Amino acid sequence: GAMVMRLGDAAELCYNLTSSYLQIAAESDSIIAQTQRAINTTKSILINETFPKWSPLNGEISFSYNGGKDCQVLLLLYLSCLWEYYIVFPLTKLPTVFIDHDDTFKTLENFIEETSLRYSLSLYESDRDKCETMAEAFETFLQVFPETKAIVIGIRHTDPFGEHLKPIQKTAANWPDFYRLQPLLHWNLANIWSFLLYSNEPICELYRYGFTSLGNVEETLPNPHLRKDKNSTPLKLNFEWEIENRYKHNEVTKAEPIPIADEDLVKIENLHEDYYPGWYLVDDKLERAGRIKKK
Numbered sequence: 001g002a003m004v005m006r007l008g009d010a011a012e013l014c015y016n017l018t019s020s021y022l023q024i025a026a027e028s029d030s031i032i033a034q035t036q037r038a039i040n041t042t043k044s045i046l047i048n049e050t051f052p053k054w055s056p057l058n059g060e061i062s063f064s065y066n067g068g069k070d071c072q073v074l075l076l077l078y079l080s081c082l083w084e085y086y087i088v089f090p091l092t093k094l095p096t097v098f099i100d101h102d103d104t105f106k107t108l109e110n111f112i113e114e115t116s117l118r119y120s121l122s123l124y125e126s127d128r129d130k131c132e133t134m135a136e137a138f139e140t141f142l143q144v145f146p147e148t149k150a151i152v153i154g155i156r157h158t159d160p161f162g163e164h165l166k167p168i169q170k171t172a173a174n175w176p177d178f179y180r181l182q183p184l185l186h187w188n189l190a191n192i193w194s195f196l197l198y199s200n201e202p203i204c205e206l207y208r209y210g211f212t213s214l215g216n217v218e219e220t221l222p223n224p225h226l227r228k229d230k231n232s233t234p235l236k237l238n239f240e241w242e243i244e245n246r247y248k249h250n251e252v253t254k255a256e257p258i259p260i261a262d263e264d265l266v267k268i269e270n271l272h273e274d275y276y277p278g279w280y281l282v283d284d285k286l287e288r289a290g291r292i293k294k295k
């Protein structure tokens with residue numbers, strides 16, 4: 001039982017849940033309203049600024065997907081926009097690129113594979129056993145796919161190296177030559193959680209265990225700001241409505257969380273502490289707080 005959707009069905013599903021999110025009744029000072037505004041900006045970037053210039057069909061656009069929450073939100077919106085642009089289906093699998101590393105969480109590896117099957121992506125993975133820079137990995141990716149003109153990148157202004165980015169932007173001089181398409185820059189952490197929880201799509205289950213940012217296995221811990229302690233003020237949930245009223249699937253689109261990898265549960269159990277899930281954090285400045293101390 002691996003949930004598989006043909007690409008067209010996946011795109012239609014994402015259009016429907018995104019449209020449904022946009023129809024949520026919310027007050028003007030709410031996280032949900034702000035997320036609706038962020039969705040509309042993302043849609044404009046893709047439908048108005050991107051697709052008229054580069055084809056998402058003929059190989060001109062590839063999607064950089066690393067299984068994390070930002071990439072996942074962006075993929076859902078990208079699929080929604082493919083449906084909206086072309087219908088509102090000419091493609092069997094969507095070209096996707098993952099830069100793999102030897103210190104990636106096993107649960108994240110599993111999730112990338114699961115989601116590649118779920119959304120009928122055509123996954124290319126760089127070689128995790130090659131010692132090389134990201135630019136080098138993409139240079140090899142361009143040699144395999146020389147038709148690529150632009151790459152969709154799930155990154156936010158609050159992320160490291162996010163400050164001086166724009167929605168459409170050529171790569172650095174030491175990269176292969178393509179346009180970076182960066183339609184998620186204006187999203188905040190709270191918007192990410194709101195949309196992702198409402199979508200009722202499977203997400204990387206590490207977030208459920210207190211992780212807020214998935215760095216590498218050696219550095220990354222559950223966020224200490226989410227550690228449960230009788231002597232700390234309990235944390236309040238900002239996404240109760242989204243969870244309780246999350247998008248209802250049909251028979252063609254049913255979903256289930258996949259449990260974390262055994263090796264990751266062992267690492268979590270060894271901490272002898274419990275954490276609120278990642279969506280109890282909404283402060284962007286503390287997103288990467290869960291880290292091993294280094295000099």
Ligand SMILES: OC[C@H]1O[C@@H](O)[C@H](O)[C@@H](O)[C@@H]1O
Binds near residue numbers: 052053054
């Ligand atoms: O304007 C950005 C891009 O738009 C595309 O439709 C053109 O074919 C490219 O030559 C150009 O770089």
Ligand SMILES: [Cl-]
Binds near residue numbers: 069070212215
């Ligand atoms: Cl993350």
